[PDB]
Amino acid sequence: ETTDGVYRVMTRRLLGSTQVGVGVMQEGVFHTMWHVTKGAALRSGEGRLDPYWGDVKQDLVSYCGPWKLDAAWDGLSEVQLLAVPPGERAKNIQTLPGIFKTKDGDIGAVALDYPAGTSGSPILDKCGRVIGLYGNGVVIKNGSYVSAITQGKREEETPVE
Partner 1 sequence: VDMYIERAGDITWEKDAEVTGNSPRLDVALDESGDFSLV
116 in contact with partner 1 (CB under 8 A) = no
- Pairing mode of beta strands 79-83, 5-12: unpaired
154 in contact with partner 1 (CB under 8 A) = no
Q: Residue from 74, 78, 88, 113 that binds ligand DE0 (CB under 6 A)?
A: 113
CB of 112 to partner 1, least distance (A): 5
- Contacting residues for 75 by C-beta, under 8 A, at least 6 apart: 108
Which of the stretches 65-73, 81-89, 112-120, 125-133 binds ligand DE0 when contact is defined by CB under 6 A?
A: 112-120
Active site residue 4: no
Helix (H) or strand (E) holding 35: helix 34-37
Instruction: Write the secondary structure of 144-161 as one string of H (helix), E (strand) and C (coil).
Output: CEEEECECCCCCCCCCCC
100 in contact with ligand DE0 (CB under 6 A) = no
Active site residue 31: no
Active site residues: 35, 59, 119
